[PDB]
Symmetry: D2
Subunit: 114 residues, 4 copies
């Protein structure tokens, strides 16, 4: 099944934040309406916050997260969760290797902001 694609409410500011847990340097691309809007990268085995940004979901509300290590796409897993019918998280894990820890890059999307 497709993973790492989320329909947000249109024209909405959201936070996107990436964490690294791997020997390899991660690259996280964040697309809004099918165009790259942010790119984060770093290397940490201790959950470094390699990037954080505020983006706008735009007219489509379509947000996609892609993860790669030195040109190789990682395997994604994802889901969305809503607390008290108000607070939204879109969650991505990724695996670059064989251990299936799926934390090699972790991406959290949150809205609303403000």
């Amino acid at each position: 099944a497709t993973q790492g694609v989320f329909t947000l409410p249109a024209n909405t500011r959201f936070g996107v934040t990436a964490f690294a847990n791997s020997s390899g340097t991660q690259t996280v691309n964040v697309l809004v309406n099918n165009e790259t809007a942010a790119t984060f990268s770093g290397q940490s085995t201790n959950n470094a916050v390699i990037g954080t940004q505020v983006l706008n979901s735009g007219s489509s509300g379509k947000v996609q997260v892609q993860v790669s290590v030195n040109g190789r796409p990682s395997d994604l897993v994802s889901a969305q969760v809503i607390l008290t019918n108000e607070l939204n998280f879109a969650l991505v894990g990724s695996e670059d290797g064989t251990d299936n820890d799926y934390n090699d890059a972790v991406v959290v999307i949150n809205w609303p902001l403000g």
Copy 2:
């Protein structure tokens, strides 16, 4: 129901990261072993990271997040999500006012690390 309390696997390192979206200065306390292990304070209406750290869940595995503003505890909401039976998120929102956006401090806990 109790909110912001999570039983992690014992003796396990975890990330805790806090984001602010409020006029109020947010104070986030993270307890392990029922004693404060990290405290983050900051202000933003743009989802700024007001703290990030790695902590150890200790012998009980019990982790608690508390949030207060102007000395008053905020109302918490939380849940845990597990992706591909491996990647864990414990998520907390909080409300310091009337709009019920529950984003006034947002806390992301994630494990495993490494």
Copy 3:
């Protein structure tokens, strides 16, 4: 925080299913258009499906779950989860007692159908 209230897409059919795990008879009430639209009752400590029904979220999309045990409202906990940006669950737990298992009546809402 408010629990057991969910904003579904308007005019959408959804399943609602209740399970019982308690010494006491559970009453589950499901509201749409702020009016009770399905009710289920039963006593089980073996996760009986005390009722399942398909309902329509109507023009507001507002769906509410209430649980009580012989008149006394239970304490609710809830969240919503979305898989592959498509499949939706709204989840309710409830506590009628002191043990905080929150399984005394469990309610699952799922959409889309068909």
Copy 4:
């Protein structure tokens, strides 16, 4: 990533319930310690409960859900959610066809019982 595999607490009773929303007869297999423990089959486009059963997670706690239609495995999506650090859901969707509604068989696992 692997989907439909969950590590429950060992030797614990859990509920497993399957719903159908498809033109085809759905077959759901529920494995405990890599051996099929329960199987549900049925057809509905109106979210009928095609099976429900209480099972024991046994010494390993490993539970796996597989879904097929007339011998063809469906594509699975899944996650786990925990409310108030107590109530657990393991959630499965499946897609048997081209529309990607992922509701063709929906499987809900819940614990603890009682």
